[PDB]
C-alpha cells in the first residue's frame, strides 16, 4: 500500500537517466527504479522484447498465416535435388557435387540477412521484405528505371522522364548533387536503354589479413 504509493514519478526518474527516452511508464513500479533505469539505459544493453504484457503467447500473428513454408538457399538449390524429390503437393547425386556445393562453391557463402547486435524479432515482423529491401537499395540507383516501371509509366525508349523538364527549371535533386542526366549535365548520346543518367563521383589495403590464396578442403 504505502510502498505502492511511495513511487516517484517517471519524469522524476527521467532526470537520473542519460538516455531518458527508453524509460517507460511501467518503470514507476520498478522495485528499484533508480537502479533499473541505470541498467536499462546502460550503453550496450538490449531492452527486453516487448511481447511481454501481451497474453497472446507471443504468436497469434495474422502475418503467421501468410508466411512462406521455406525457400532453399540458392547455393543448395543449385544441387538440383529440388527436381529430384518433389516436396510440394532415386535422383542419383555426386559426392563431389554436394561436397563442393558446401565447401568449394559455398565456403564464402553466408545468409544475406542475418541480424545485428540488438535486432530482436517482434511478432508482426517479417525479415523477408526487409531482405528484398536491403537488396533493392543495392541494385536500384537513380538515373535508371526498369522496363516494367517504364512500361507502366508509358515512357518510350530514348525519351527522358517527365521530371527532367521540371528538373530543368527547378534544378538537380538536392539529395543527388553528383547526379547526371542526358540532355542536361550529361551527354545525351550516352543515353542507353533503361539508364538515362548516372551519378558521377567526385571523390576520385589488404587489411593486414589478406589471405592472398583460397584453398578449400578436398573430399578425395
Amino acid at each position: 500500500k504505502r510502498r505502492k504509493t511511495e513511487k516517484p514519478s517517471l519524469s522524476q526518474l527521467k532526470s537520473q537517466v542519460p538516455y531518458p527516452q527508453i524509460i517507460e511508464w511501467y518503470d514507476c513500479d520498478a522495485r528499484y527504479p533508480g537502479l533499473l533505469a541505470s541498467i536499462k539505459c546502460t550503453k550496450n544493453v538490449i531492452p527486453v522484447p516487448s511481447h511481454w504484457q501481451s497474453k497472446k503467447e507471443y504468436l497469434s500473428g495474422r502475418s503467421l498465416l501468410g508466411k512462406r513454408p521455406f525457400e532453399l538457399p540458392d547455393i543448395i538449390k543449385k544441387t538440383n535435388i529440388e527436381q529430384m524429390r518433389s516436396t510440394l503437393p532415386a535422383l542419383d547425386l555426386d559426392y563431389k557435387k554436394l561436397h563442393d556445393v558446401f565447401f568449394k562453391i559455398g565456403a564464402n557463402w553466408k545468409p544475406d540477412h542475418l541480424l545485428c547486435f540488438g535486432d530482436v524479432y517482434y511478432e508482426n515482423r517479417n525479415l523477408f521484405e526487409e531482405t528484398n529491401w536491403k537488396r533493392m537499395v543495392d541494385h536500384k540507383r537513380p538515373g535508371r528505371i526498369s522496363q516494367e516501371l517504364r512500361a507502366i509509366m508509358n515512357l518510350p525508349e530514348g525519351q527522358l522522364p517527365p521530371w527532367c523538364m521540371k528538373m530543368k527549371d527547378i534544378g538537380l535533386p538536392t539529395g543527388y548533387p553528383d547526379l547526371k542526366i542526358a540532355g542536361l549535365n550529361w551527354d545525351i548520346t550516352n543515353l542507353k536503354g533503361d539508364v538515362y543518367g548516372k551519378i558521377i563521383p567526385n571523390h576520385h589495403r589488404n587489411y593486414f589479413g589478406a589471405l592472398i590464396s583460397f584453398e578449400t578442403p578436398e573430399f578425395e
Partner: protein, 53 residues
C-alpha cells in the same frame, strides 16, 4: 497537459503521445516534440526535463 482531458483507455492515452494537439501543447508550450517527452502527464515536470534538455 491536454485540457485536463479524460481518456477512456490506456492504449488510447498511449496513442495520445503522438498526436497533433498533444504536440501542439508541447511545442507551443516551449517543450519541443517527439520521443523524449512521451511519458509526460503533468505540464510541470517536463519543464524541468526540457531545462535538462
Amino acid at each position: 497537459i491536454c485540457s485536463n482531458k479524460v481518456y477512456n483507455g490506456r492504449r488510447t492515452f498511449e496513442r495520445h503521445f503522438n498526436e497533433e494537439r498533444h504536440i501542439y501543447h508541447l511545442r507551443c508550450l516551449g517543450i519541443e516534440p517527439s520521443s523524449v517527452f512521451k511519458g509526460i502527464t503533468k505540464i510541470k515536470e517536463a519543464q524541468e526535463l526540457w531545462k535538462n534538455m
